[PDB]
Design a protein around this nucleic acid. Structure first.
Ligand SMILES: [K+]
Ligand SMILES: [K+]
Ligand SMILES: [K+]
Ligand SMILES: [K+]
Ligand SMILES: [Mg+2]
Ligand SMILES: [Mg+2]
Ligand SMILES: [Mg+2]
Ligand SMILES: [Mg+2]
Ligand SMILES: [Mg+2]
Ligand SMILES: [Mg+2]
Ligand SMILES: [Mg+2]
Ligand SMILES: [Mg+2]
Ligand SMILES: [Mg+2]
Lengths: 114, 55, 123, 130, 55, 123
RNA sequence: CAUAGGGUUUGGUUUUUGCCCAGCCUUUAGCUUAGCGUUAAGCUUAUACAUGCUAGCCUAAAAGACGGCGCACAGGUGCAUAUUUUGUAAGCAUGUAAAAUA
RNA sequence: AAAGUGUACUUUAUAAAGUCAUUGUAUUGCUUACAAAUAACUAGGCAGUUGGGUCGGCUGCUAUACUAUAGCGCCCCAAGCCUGAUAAUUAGCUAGGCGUAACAG
RNA sequence: GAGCUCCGGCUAAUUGUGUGCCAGCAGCCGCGGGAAUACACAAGGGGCCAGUUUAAGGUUAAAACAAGGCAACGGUGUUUAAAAACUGGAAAUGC
């Protein structure tokens, strides 16, 4: 939809590790200052980025971020060979149990059914 | 016998008990320690303690 | 580590020391001055820095640096000591708070008066 | 908890008494594993004829002594006991006669065939019950 | 009390069903293993006849 | 945490009591079943049965909530309401009003100012 | 309700390890400070203590407790305690037993 | 039992009641299991110590269960019981609470 | 409007005068030897605000169960080995 990534991405450029996690539209950007500037250029609006390892050389960090974006897969890749209708659906994402307990809230009723 | 056992198996109430297993299990006790010696001096005793048909 | 190693106390929490052990986890400590003198810094610096030897109320003896320009500290003077290390002076890890019981503020100070114990001039 | 246990007999040196070993696990929240542990319990044996190595079932009971608060209810497996007289008879049979290569192999084949045939009949009966 | 009695009857029925499933499974495995043993026995008989000629 | 008690007292009485849960000059009460001899706001209870707001609102009324079914249960078991709880139950029509004895003492002339030194300072 | 880094090691680069800083929460010290209403609170000593107060009420075998009911409730502290405790679960025989209703 | 009973006590041309004393189907309960900080430069610990038998273990006043917590105590009998035991250091425990995406602290 | 603190870089915010490795500053890298945006003072400006800036504690800035190394330095001289954990295997004899 021009604002986030299709799924979770993990890439290993030489001595650098980058992780990308999709977020709901309007959530915002959670990343370092360097990646914040890069996201503005590309148009990414909602994402969480975590980078670790030997990050002294910023050329490698930018290169790793560039390569990670190119490892995504789309629902329309070779769809003609599936014989089905790949339909977009609305499903709210969940958080871990610890987050619910600390905030004093409940998950969707579909899981609490008892 | 295992970790929690202190005697050998198949011991009836009438049969006697020994300390052969306790030495093997709790081998760290100083009461069961010996002095350094040669291989033959240490192996010969163990060999005879298992075969009762050798003088 | 394996599961067995972790169960048998494999991991031990790292322990970090304090930078002012003589304070016994207290923000400040009172003491009495034993000797007042000057010392020279290490390379590449050069100066005659004012220091004093103070015996704390807990019985420990430490070296304290006197900030500012000039002081009226003598032997047998009650002072209050806080943390803080002077990098160029080896072995000095404490500083004297000015304006308190016996130490007075620097005369003529106009800026950062609070850090040197000088009251605001009413005139 | 602790109403009933199944364990192994590790001591029969007391009068109408026995010690039984038990295995259990404990959850360690920090490492997400189950830790295997052991315990020892003393039980009352009315028969006073238990053998070290037996598997028995013990049940909670009224306190009888300082360290005895259980009673032996049943035995699930009896420990093997060496018997010299029986072993000697078996040795005599083994030494009584010997067979050649072909005779022994043929006898082995016949015995397996008979065992297989009986097993097939039992399996068919089980299917019929189903 | 009425609900408790029905639960006890339900438990007995479920246990009987489970035992039958296990018994059939055990018999199936045993039958397969015995067949493998029989095949090896037939092979051994041929080798025994061959070995006797060498002697 | 605050598991409710199940065993009944053997040497004391059960009562239905008011628990102060207000603010400075803003009282608010909760009704609960508690042992007769305890602290006022003790955490030992058998059940919480209602609440009361004694001050008037814009509508000129006071507001009171209660469990009708559970009040009857505890009254049957032997719980004895206090004097104020009898008044609330009597007006709410749960049980008949309890008569009060005659009064002869001259009533207090300073009831809302005797215990408030702030007003007396202005007086 | 969902994971952010920067500075530093002086031929250059890459790599490994250490050090420092930015947040939130909590107490003191310097300088400085008009008022009213209100929430949550008194974080070092089981160190030594002048003085006032915190549990009494009622009745009467001759105007008086000797008797009845309370002090088995509240309030204070964390010396000692690794289990004596704390947090949980489980166990503990019977149609409650007698009597011609002939 | 938010009860009954009284050769009892107090008040009344107005009286209903309370006070004191006494009474309950066995007349106020014991036991076991699991979890919870460091610690081997603490390796042996225990002799009433582990188990068995007689006796004792009181405060009465339904009937049986062949005596119906217990080395809890005396006497006698058999040698067993524990072994990361025993000995040390530190701390009241649970939990609200504070940091953390969480796990953890 | 009112105070406290800061203006070389990390980090938002500069000019003048005095001093001359002296007096002093400093969380880190570091400033001062006669031309100092880093010391002292004046002016100008930044931050927070009836508060503000040190010092001292808990936790975070993944100590690695989710998730670190023995390839910068660390695997111990070798073998045998009835606890524990994990888990079937190709052995013995004769000229
Ligand atoms: K100065
Ligand atoms: K204190
Ligand atoms: K009485
Ligand atoms: K070596
Ligand atoms: Mg990171
Ligand atoms: Mg040698
Ligand atoms: Mg300054
Ligand atoms: Mg935070
Ligand atoms: Mg009375
Ligand atoms: Mg203590
Ligand atoms: Mg700037
Ligand atoms: Mg600066
Ligand atoms: Mg300056």
């Amino acid at each position: 939809r021009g604002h986030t990534v299709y799924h979770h991405v993990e890439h290993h450029f030489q001595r650098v590790k980058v992780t990308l996690s999709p977020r709901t539209s309007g959530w915002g950007l959670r990343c370092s200052n360097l990646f914040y500037e890069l996201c503005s250029l590309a148009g990414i609006r909602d994402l969480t980025v975590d980078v670790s390892g030997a990050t002294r050389n910023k050329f490698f960090v930018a290169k790793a971020f560039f390569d990670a974006l190119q490892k995504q897969t789309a629902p329309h890749d070779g769809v003609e060979g599936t014989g089905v209708y790949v339909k977009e659906v609305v499903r709210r994402p969940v958080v871990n149990l610890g987050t619910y307990r600390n905030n004093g809230t409940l998950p969707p009723k579909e899981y609490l059914a008892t | 016998p295992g970790x929690x056992x202190x005697x050998x198996x198949x011991x009836x109430x009438x049969x006697x008990x020994x300390x052969x297993x306790x030495x093997x299990x709790x081998x760290x006790x100083x009461x069961x320690x010996x002095x350094x010696x040669x291989x033959x001096x240490x192996x010969x005793x163990x060999x005879x303690x298992x075969x009762x048909x050798x003088x | 580590l394996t599961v067995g190693q972790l169960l048998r106390g494999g991991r031990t929490k790292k322990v970090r020391r304090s930078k002012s052990p003589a304070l016994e986890q207290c923000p400040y400590k009172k003491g009495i001055c034993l000797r007042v003198y000057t010392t020279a810094p290490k390379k590449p610096n050069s100066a005659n820095r004012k220091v004093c030897k103070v015996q704390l109320s807990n019985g420990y003896k430490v070296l304290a640096y006197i900030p500012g320009e000039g002081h009226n500290l003598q032997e047998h003077s009650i002072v209050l000591v806080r943390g803080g290390r002077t990098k160029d002076l080896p072995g000095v890890k404490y500083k004297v708070i000015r304006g308190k019981y016996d130490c007075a503020g620097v005369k003529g100070r106009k800026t950062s008066r609070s850090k040197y114990g000088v009251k605001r001039p009413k005139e | 908890g602790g109403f009933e246990f199944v364990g192994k007999v590790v001591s029969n040196r007391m009068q109408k008494g026995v010690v039984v070993a038990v295995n259990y696990v404990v959850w360690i929240p920090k490492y997400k594993v189950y830790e295997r542990r052991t315990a020892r319990h003393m039980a009352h044996d009315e028969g006073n004829s238990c053998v070290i190595g037996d598997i028995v079932r013990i049940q909670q009971h009224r306190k009888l002594s300082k360290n005895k608060a259980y009673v032996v209810v049943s035995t699930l497996k009896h420990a093997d006991v060496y018997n010299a007289k029986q072993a000697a008879v078996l040795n005599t049979e083994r030494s009584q006669n010997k067979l050649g290569r072909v005779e022994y192999a043929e006898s082995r084949l016949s015995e397996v065939q008979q065992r297989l045939l009986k097993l097939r009949e039992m399996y068919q009966k089980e299917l019929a019950l189903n | 009390e009425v609900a408790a009695e029905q639960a006890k009857v339900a438990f007995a029925e479920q246990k009987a069903a489970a035992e039958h499933v296990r018994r059939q499974a055990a018999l199936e495995e045993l039958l397969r293993k015995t067949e493998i043993e029989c095949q090896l026995a037939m092979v051994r008989v041929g080798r025994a006849q061959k070995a006797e000629e060498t002697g | 945490m605050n598991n409710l008690l199940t065993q009944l007292p053997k040497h004391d009485l059960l009562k239905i009591k008011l628990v102060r849960w207000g603010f400075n000059k803003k009282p608010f009460y909760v009704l609960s079943v508690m042992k007769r001899r305890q602290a006022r706001n003790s955490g030992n209870r058998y059940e919480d049965i209602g609440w009361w707001d004694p001050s008037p609102h814009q509508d000129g009324n006071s507001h009171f909530g209660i469990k009708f079914d559970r009040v009857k249960y505890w009254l049957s078991q032997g719980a004895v309401p206090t004097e104020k709880v009898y008044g609330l139950f009597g007006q709410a029509g749960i049980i008949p009003q309890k008569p009060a004895p005659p009064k002869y003492k001259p009533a207090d002339g300073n009831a809302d100012t005797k215990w408030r030194p702030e007003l007396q300072k202005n007086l």
